[PDB]
Write a protein that binds this ligand. Structure first.
Ligand SMILES: Nc1nc2c(ncn2[C@@H]2O[C@H](COP(=O)(O)OP(=O)(O)NP(=O)(O)O)[C@@H](O)[C@H]2O)c(=O)[nH]1
Ligand SMILES: [Cl-]
Ligand SMILES: [Mg+2]
Length: 288
């Protein structure tokens, strides 16, 4: 993989020489590479929006928090590559957080809240095409379910989905303030400097104009990978002027949707393994 990608980087970016290249991360349909111990290259076989977002934010944010600044891009239907200088630091984790003093933890939370406040406050007219309607997306995904596999699902599966749609239809949490959100704001995207302060934020690949509540979904998550509900709550108090009970209702609805989202990903990409994982996850959730 590394040789192919070294070839493509050198072929598409004329004067660029690859002296070293390793895989630094990978998703289910992308790979990220650290090149020359100094550049991140994110690749995929979309990136246009992500690039337009980095470029919008590097123009308009006033902050000492670093974000990707795109120096190299190649965008086509069949291949997309974004390259930028690696932001240096350590990724925030539960382990690191629990070793911080009370005052270190407070300052980190203040940093986060301040970043979010600043980004959510931007005039988003120049990026106004990047709208995301989560409720409408879910309805369209449900229609796709009904057109494909819904009738072969079990009753326990069908009840879970219907019960979710009844809840979606009763909620008011999509009727609030819209703004530009990171939209994948988990602690594996936050970088700390040597004083445990926020030095950088990565992966605005899902960013767009969407509910303000979106950027608290992971901050409020209780799981091995995130810090915890209390972290999110304190950040919400520092951020201010936001209904904390609704932020939590929004997180709770998104977490309920997860197995259905997983099924849908499998339908859209013809990956049976994902249809099966989501269906199984419905059974796991039902038997708590
Ligand atoms: N230190 C550092 N690591 C980075 C940087 N950019 C990317 N990475 C590393 O590369 C990984 C993948 O980058 P990312 O943008 O999150 O990839 P993705 O394709 O959007 N995947 P996902 O949405 O699943 O997080 C990150 O988890 C991190 O390990 C950067 O600026 N600095
Ligand atoms: Cl299946
Ligand atoms: Mg991403």
């Amino acid at each position: 993989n590394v040789k192919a990608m070294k070839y493509l980087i050198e072929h598409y970016f004329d004067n660029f020489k690859v002296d070293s290249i390793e895989i630094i991360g990978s998703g289910y349909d992308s790979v990220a590479y650290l090149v020359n111990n100094e550049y991140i290259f994110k690749t995929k076989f979309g990136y246009a929006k992500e690039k337009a977002i980095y470029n919008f934010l590097n123009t308009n944010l006033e902050t000492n928090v670093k974000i990707p600044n795109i120096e190299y891009s190649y965008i086509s239907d069949e291949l997309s590559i974004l390259g930028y200088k690696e932001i240096k630091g350590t990724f925030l984790t539960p382990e690191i957080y629990s070793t911080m003093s009370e005052e270190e933890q407070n300052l980190l939370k203040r940093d986060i809240a301040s970043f979010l406040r600043q980004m959510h406050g931007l005039d988003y007219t120049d990026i106004s095409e990047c709208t995301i309607d989560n409720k409408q997306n879910v309805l369209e995904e449900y229609i796709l379910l009904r057109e494909t596999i819904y009738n072969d699902l079990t009753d326990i599966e069908k009840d879970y989905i219907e019960s979710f749609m009844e809840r979606l239809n009763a909620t008011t949490v999509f009727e609030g303030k819209k703004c530009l959100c990171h939209n994948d704001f988990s602690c594996n995207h936050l970088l700390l400097d040597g004083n445990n302060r926020l030095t950088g934020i990565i992966d605005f690949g899902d960013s767009g104009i969407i509910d303000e509540y979106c950027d608290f979904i992971y901050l409020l998550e209780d799981s091995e990978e995130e810090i915890g509900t209390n972290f999110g709550e304190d950040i919400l108090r520092m951020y201010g002027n936001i209904d904390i009970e609704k932020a939590k209702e929004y997180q709770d609805i998104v977490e309920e949707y997860y197995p259905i989202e997983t099924i849908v990903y499998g339908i859209k990409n013809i990956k049976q393994e994902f249809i099966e994982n989501g269906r199984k996850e419905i059974y796991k959730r039902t038997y708590k």
